[PDB]
Amino acid sequence: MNTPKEEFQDWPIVRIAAHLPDLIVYGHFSPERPFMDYFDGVLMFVDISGFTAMTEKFSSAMYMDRGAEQLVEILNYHISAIVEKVLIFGGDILKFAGDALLALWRVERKQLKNIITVVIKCSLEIHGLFETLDIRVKIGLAAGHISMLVFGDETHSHFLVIGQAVDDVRLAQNMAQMNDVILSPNCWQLCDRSMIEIESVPDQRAVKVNFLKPPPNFNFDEFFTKCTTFMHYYPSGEHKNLLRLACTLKPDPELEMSLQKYVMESILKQIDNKQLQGYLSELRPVTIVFVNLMFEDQDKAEEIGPAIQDAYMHITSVLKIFQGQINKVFMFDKGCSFLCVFGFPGEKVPDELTHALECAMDIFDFCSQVHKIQTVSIGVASGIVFCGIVGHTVRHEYTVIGQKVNLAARMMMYYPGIVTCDSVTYNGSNLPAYFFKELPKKVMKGVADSGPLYQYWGRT
Amino acid sequence: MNTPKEEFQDWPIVRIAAHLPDLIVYGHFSPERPFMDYFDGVLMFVDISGFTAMTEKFSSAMYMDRGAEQLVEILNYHISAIVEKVLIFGGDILKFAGDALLALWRVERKQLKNIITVVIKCSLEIHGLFETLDIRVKIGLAAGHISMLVFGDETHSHFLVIGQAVDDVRLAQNMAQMNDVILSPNCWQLCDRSMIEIESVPDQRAVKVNFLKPPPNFNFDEFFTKCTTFMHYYPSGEHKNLLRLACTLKPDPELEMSLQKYVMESILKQIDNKQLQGYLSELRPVTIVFVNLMFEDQDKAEEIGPAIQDAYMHITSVLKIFQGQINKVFMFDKGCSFLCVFGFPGEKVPDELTHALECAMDIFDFCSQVHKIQTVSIGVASGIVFCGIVGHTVRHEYTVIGQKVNLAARMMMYYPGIVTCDSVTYNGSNLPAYFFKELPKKVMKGVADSGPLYQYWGRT
Amino acid sequence: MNTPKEEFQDWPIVRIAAHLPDLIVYGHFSPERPFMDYFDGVLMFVDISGFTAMTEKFSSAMYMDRGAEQLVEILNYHISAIVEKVLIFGGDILKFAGDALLALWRVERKQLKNIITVVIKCSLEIHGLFETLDIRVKIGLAAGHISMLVFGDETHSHFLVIGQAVDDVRLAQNMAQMNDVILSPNCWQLCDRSMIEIESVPDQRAVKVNFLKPPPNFNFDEFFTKCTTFMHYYPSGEHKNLLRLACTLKPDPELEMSLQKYVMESILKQIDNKQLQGYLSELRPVTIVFVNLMFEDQDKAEEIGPAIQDAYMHITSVLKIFQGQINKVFMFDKGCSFLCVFGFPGEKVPDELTHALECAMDIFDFCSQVHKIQTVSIGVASGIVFCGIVGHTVRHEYTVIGQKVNLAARMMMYYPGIVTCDSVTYNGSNLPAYFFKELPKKVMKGVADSGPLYQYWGRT
Ligand SMILES: [Cl-]
Ligand SMILES: [Cl-]
Ligand SMILES: [Cl-]
Ligand SMILES: [Cl-]
Ligand SMILES: [Cl-]
Ligand SMILES: [Cl-]
Ligand SMILES: [Mg+2]
Ligand SMILES: [Mg+2]
Ligand SMILES: [Mg+2]
């Protein structure tokens, strides 16, 4: 009797799970919203400098109208290799945002010290990969208490991580010079200082890794193996040749209903082989609406979670009206940021600019009154942005990359408490000039020369 | 000199052969119609109870408009595993019909007794697979003389199996309680009774398998191996890692011309990569026209074969006019049944209901006069039905599943000799009310409450 | 720590490289046009007789409108096996043209004698493959100096090989009887005559291979292994299981920009998953415009290269206006031939016939005045031709096959110095009858009975 080969089955549920971390796929938590969970772990925030600049160059005539295809290919070639390392070292990729990603090693408190060594080793191997293409890898690490919030409505779900370790990991990555691995103060306080050799960082308690200095009988493979005891989903035994246990998920309509809620419709269409793969990688003209909600205490999930859910319910209803979409949510700019996009697949519409502005104003008005929201800031920028699936075959997400994405984020940060827009949006909108105010030009982190910027004052 | 890997070649001919049994693929018989062949074997009829009910639930809002995709995924996950067992145990899957399938082990008369043991073992392993999802597997087995009929025209071919073993296998499966394996009387008469332990079945000569009771020196692998001598296409040697020898078929335009005639155009389009895969799995509104032809002796292929071919030639010409398609033909309801569908891919048309009724009347009028056809009955029902490819990658077919499919079949059986329709069809058709007669409500096997039923009396 | 499977990555650059020889993929030469390179090697020109005739038969009703699909499947089944042999024996496939291909073994002068033995062995194994389907394999071999010319503009590139060995290989193949391997005179002069047993060919210095007659201690595997020292891209070591080193190419935007210029837009669309695969294999009505440029010395690349580039620049600009495309360029008919097509994917347009004729006249007028071009001849024929991707998964190209392709080539050869057309083109064009002249019928190599032929005299 034969024992024939079992071909890998790429069921729709498996394809869906590529878009999500193990934290969600194997989380099986309540469908109630907001939902909050608390745990400890080590975070890694990896950023490829320089793709944002390459993006503009891939629109040029030398690319012969295949810029989007070339961009995604070269980006994914590099990001795939970073994803593989993270996964092989036992991490869970939580999210991609542009040319960066955030990974988590969730463990019990007693295991943080050892897992920090694992993650540093991983980081140094990732630093390794690229001595190549004007691009640099910067890595920030943090460790400690982490909260997760899941929010949404009956057909859409989103999650976010919250807390000091989350803020620290982004602060650490922002200090990295072009190839550094930076540890947060708490990470450094919890790590095995007898093996990790660091330099200090000016006016900073975070530190920079120089190298690992193992002791005499230390063997990293044996050490790693001990650490895998604490890794619930590390592929093993018959499945040790897989990059994710998620590749083995089996059809289950209840689970698939739950997971799909995290994924946008247009991506589900592709998964379901109802649209040609070529069409989700595009350089398309869009308007970014980058919404920031600041709270008194941005580390306190039980406080901020209800407020986020409240804001989300309104945000989603006005985006529906004005035809925009939430691409990503994350803690960023000392609060909760929503990266919204006007002109994604299926929503390229005339009067997009006007709509983006009216939507921004509405969200500003509403969110300003959610009582625990202290300040709302919204940046609106329009231009050609890369929209597509970034990552590895086994772990990837739809994201946006572009100078206008960065501009909208910087506007929102440098002009708090108001709705701002760039010149393209201003000049292209239907709206009368006196609905706007031309603003003082501010020198902004990583922004060459936006032309004039404006406040959208509204019909007031 | 290198000996490089030879990648599997999924030629169009191989993709076509997934849709057909070895009985056709390797049959090389005459293109003349009707064609009849006679042989012996063991039949297995496997039915998943409960998908028909799940179908209705996959239209509900909880499925977020991906019901067809979820349905097919969960169905195929389960059916694939059953197909694999059948194939590994040496069976030929003849046909899928909804959530059931029919498999054949063709052998010489002397080998029936041993092959029956093989098929029972297979059955018990399939019974095994599912202690899981409100779904149960019921299996009926028969053994003896079998006839095959091939019928059609110059561009379409169909086949069917005929005879007492064929009737017995469906009778046996209809008696199975929710997880039973039932043997037909003749199967029980031919089997190795010294190993097969059974309970009797009330008012029935068919029996129920409890277990296999092998003798002392018996080894099933060694036994199976002896049995493989009689299996012409059992994958072996270099190809022992394949589920079907058909996976090795090589391009051959003559053979492909012959095989394609069995496959619908829309499926050939997909095979030929002229349509997105996503589009053949759908929950779509259709009208089922279930045609039953009864003969004096439904086991006598040389009698009934010419009549079937005659009926087929007319059926296909009126379906062409009224825009319907034959989905399946099989012996069922004490005669030859044609499962016809209005509104398949490419044939969603306005006035579908009217057309389905006019077509039914025409077929009724014509087939009533084919002299060896004793009675014609036709049931017509309209609603949302699952249309898509069911089975395993290596062996699968386009089929329909739905409460309205079952209703049309039950109408045709419980209201013989006339054309009947359900309320949706009646209410939605163009036709005047006096073309119909409201009928007495009958309590019908596996039907909750159809609203009123009607006879289509016609313009008479 | 796991070492998980690395799935093959079919990046766009790898898919592009399937369409090109190693001569281009790994050539890294100047983007300046014309560019010329000089080297030595052995050429093999392999032709499948009989597909051109099968093409007409695949339009018949027996193929049930899947003729294009059946044709390509059976063609590629056979051509794939020939491609595999060529590649395993270390050859570079340069180009496909219809049902023929041209392969190169580039080596230093001292290695020609040994590599000729390798290529003969390959040839005899290819002769081997087909004792099968009215089809025969004819092979011509040549060896010596070869020149390469690359020509084009800022977004399109083409290459061609030039010289006596190039002319000899096509002459050798034209003398092959239905299964022969023929050596050019120079090939025979350079080969190891002590192992190669030949018959002479009447009124010819080329010879026919009967067999290899190795000496006593000769071992072909050991011999081949020595020869692989001279093969720069022979897959080896970890990659010895690959048919091409090109399957390992990694993303590189500079290289991809360069390579894509050789590939037509419609094929790039498919590579980029922006169109269903099914659509590039078609039997479509087209007009072939076969342009031949004769020079004084067709072996002298530094002479003819500037002229070809000049002609190309005009040809491409008028084809753009009249909506045609260059499918292939090669040395053929004692000069440089351009195989142009009106009605490819995306360019099916009304008044195609007229356009093809106006374009032909324009090209004739212009190219006649490029001073080193001695004579221009252009044949124009219209009919159903097979258009699609021919070859192996790892090495394939878009090409055309059809009786009208052959007719246009034969017209251009047998009616030099003028623009000619067939009856379909004449009868179907918009143009007045007196723009044409009916011509004497000539008996033409491999052409049954074109109806009348005409000169396109023009408005003169
Ligand atoms: Cl997050
Ligand atoms: Cl998000
Ligand atoms: Cl049947
Ligand atoms: Cl059927
Ligand atoms: Cl060439
Ligand atoms: Cl070419
Ligand atoms: Mg970045
Ligand atoms: Mg059923
Ligand atoms: Mg040829």
DSSP for B367-399 reads HTTSTTEEEEEEEEEEEEEEEEEEEETTEEEEE
H runs (alpha helix) in C162-219: 164-175, 185-190
Q: What is the DSSP letter of A422?
A: -
Which residue of chain C is at minimal alpha-carbon distance from B252? C74
Q: What is the full DSSP assignment across A311-328?
A: HHHHHHHHHHHHTEEEEE
Tokens of C212: 């290899």
Q: How big is chain A by its Cα radius of gyration, in Å?
A: 22
Exp. method: X-ray
Same CATH fold assignment for domains A34-246 and A279-460: yes
Distance, CA of B106 to CA of C324 (rounded, Å): 58
User: What's the Cα-to-Cα distance from B42 to each of B188, B394, C363, rounded to whole Å?
Assistant: 12, 22, 72
Q: Is residue B217 part of an annotated ligand binding site?
A: no
Chain A positions in Cβ-Cβ contact with residue C250 (cut-off 8 Å): 77
Q: Which residues contact A93 (CB under 8 A, 6 or more apart)?
A: A21, A83, A86, A87, A101, A102, A103, A391, A395
Using the Cβ of C238 and the Cβ atoms of chain B, whether some distance falls under 8 Å is answered with no
Using the Cβ of C303 and the Cβ atoms of chain B, whether some distance falls under 8 Å is answered with no
Ligand nearest the Cα atom of residue C336: 5
Tokens 């041209």 sit on residue: C102
Q: How big is chain C by its Cα radius of gyration, in Å?
A: 22
Tokens of A389: 């699936």
Q: Do B64 and A5 touch (CB under 8 A)?
A: no
Buried b (16+ CB within 10 A) or exposed e, C34-71: bbbbeebbbbbbbbbbebbebbbebbeeebbebbbbbb
The helices-and-strands tally (H runs, E runs) of chain B is 14, 16
Tokens of B148: 């095959």
Q: Which of C4, C272, C275 sits opposite A69 (nearest CB)?
A: C272
Distance, CA of B250 to CA of B198 (rounded, Å): 45
| C-alpha neighbours within 13 Å on the C-beta side of residue A279 | 14
User: What's the Cα-to-Cα distance from A124 to each of A121, A141, A211, A391, rounded to whole Å?
Assistant: 5, 12, 8, 20
Answer yes or no: are the C-beta atoms of C53 and C446 closer than 8 Å. no
The three-class DSSP label of residue C103 is: strand
Chain C positions in Cβ-Cβ contact with residue A235 (cut-off 8 Å): 2, 4
Tokens of A446: 């990583």
Q: Do A2 and B235 touch (CB under 8 A)?
A: yes
For residue B389, the Cα-to-chain-centroid distance in whole angstroms is: 13
* ∠ Cα C117 C120 C126 (to 5°): 145
User: What's the Cα-to-Cα distance from B104 to each of A115, A327, B95, rounded to whole Å?
Assistant: 57, 53, 10
Nearest of C364, C440, C446, C371 to residue C408 by alpha carbon: C446
Q: Do A268 and B66 touch (CB under 8 A)?
A: yes
Which amino acid appears at position C17 of this protein?
A
The three-class DSSP label of residue B287 is: strand
Answer yes or no: are the C-beta atoms of B302 and B36 closer than 8 Å. yes
Distance, CA of B433 to CA of B441 (rounded, Å): 18
Domain spans, chain C: 34-246, 279-460
Nearest of A8, A71, A53 to residue C11 by alpha carbon: A71
Question: CATH: 3.40.50.720, 3.30.1330.40, 3.30.70.1230, 3.40.50.300. Which one for B34-246?
Answer: 3.30.70.1230
Show which subunits contact C, needing at least 3 CB pairs below 8 angstroms.
Answer: A, B
Q: Which of A2, A5, A274 sits opposite B279 (nearest CB)?
A: A274
Please give, rounded to a whole number of angstroms, the shortest distance from the CA of C24 to a CA of chain B: 23
Q: Is A60 exposed, middle or buried (0-12, 13-18, 19+ CB in 10 A)?
A: exposed
Q: Which of B5, B12, B268 sits opposite C73 (nearest CB)?
A: B12
Which residue of chain B is at minimal alpha-carbon distance from C81? B6
Using the Cβ of A125 and the Cβ atoms of chain C, whether some distance falls under 8 Å is answered with no
Please give, rounded to a whole number of angstroms, the shortest distance from the CA of B214 to a CA of chain A: 18
State this model's resolution in angstroms. Answer: 1.9
Distance, CA of B188 to CA of B194 (rounded, Å): 11
Q: Is residue A409 part of an annotated ligand binding site?
A: yes
Using the Cβ of C134 and the Cβ atoms of chain B, whether some distance falls under 8 Å is answered with no
Answer yes or no: are the C-beta atoms of C362 and C303 closer than 8 Å. no
Q: Which of B1, B7, B276 sits opposite C393 (nearest CB)?
A: B7
**Pairs of CB atoms within 8 A across A/B:** 59
What is the whole-number distance in angstroms between the Cα of residue C262 and the centre of ligand 2? Answer: 41
What is the whole-number distance in angstroms between the Cα of residue C328 and the centre of ligand 6? Answer: 4
**Pairs of CB atoms within 8 A across B/C:** 59
Breaks in chain A (C to N over 2.5 Å), named by the residue before each, are: 132
Q: Do B11 and C243 touch (CB under 8 A)?
A: no
Pairing of strands A157-162, A35-49: unpaired
Q: Which of A3, A155, A273 sits opposite B64 (nearest CB)?
A: A155
Chain B positions in Cβ-Cβ contact with residue C241 (cut-off 8 Å): 2, 4-5
The three-class DSSP label of residue A281 is: coil
Distance, CA of A211 to CA of A195 (rounded, Å): 8
What is the whole-number distance in angstroms between the Cα of residue A219 and the centre of ligand 2? Answer: 38
Q: Which residues contact B248 (CB under 8 A, 6 or more apart)?
A: B14, B239, B242
Chosen from A153, A157, A272 to mutate, greatest number of chain B CBs within 10 A: A272
Using the Cβ of C2 and the Cβ atoms of chain A, whether some distance falls under 8 Å is answered with yes
Strands (E), A281-372: 282-295, 324-332, 335-342
Q: Do A4 and B278 touch (CB under 8 A)?
A: no
Using the Cβ of B277 and the Cβ atoms of chain C, whether some distance falls under 8 Å is answered with no
Q: What is the full DSSP assignment across C340-385?
A: EEES-TT---TTHHHHHHHHHHHHHHHHTTSTTEEEEEEEEEEEEE
Q: What is the full DSSP assignment across C203-235?
A: TEEEEEEEEE---TT--HHHHHHHHHTT-TT--
- Which residues lie across from C137 on neighbouring strands? C48
Ligand nearest the Cα atom of residue A104: 1
CATH class of segment(s) B279-460: alpha beta
Ligand nearest the Cα atom of residue A330: 1
Distance, CA of B309 to CA of B300 (rounded, Å): 14
Q: What is the DSSP letter of B89?
A: T
Q: Is residue A10 part of an annotated ligand binding site?
A: no
H runs (alpha helix) in B235-328: 253-260, 265-271, 301-322
Q: Is residue C79 part of an annotated ligand binding site?
A: no
Q: Is residue B51 part of an annotated ligand binding site?
A: yes
- For C226, other C-beta atoms within 10 Å of its C-beta total 10
Nearest of A302, A303, A348 to residue A325 by alpha carbon: A348
Nearest of C272, C424, C282, C276 to residue C345 by alpha carbon: C282
Q: Do C224 and B274 touch (CB under 8 A)?
A: no
The dihedral built from the CA positions of residue C265, C266, C269 and C274, taken in this order, carries a sign that is positive
Distance, CA of A62 to CA of A44 (rounded, Å): 36
Task: Write down how long chain C is.
Answer: 460
Pairing of strands B35-49, B136-152: antiparallel
Q: Do B242 and A4 touch (CB under 8 A)?
A: yes
Which amino acid appears at position C352 of this protein?
E
What is the whole-number distance in angstroms between the Cα of residue B110 and the centre of ligand 3? Answer: 24
Pairing of strands C373-392, C395-401: antiparallel
Q: Which residues contact B175 (CB under 8 A, 6 or more apart)?
A: B140, B182, B201, B204, B206
Q: Do C155 and A279 touch (CB under 8 A)?
A: no
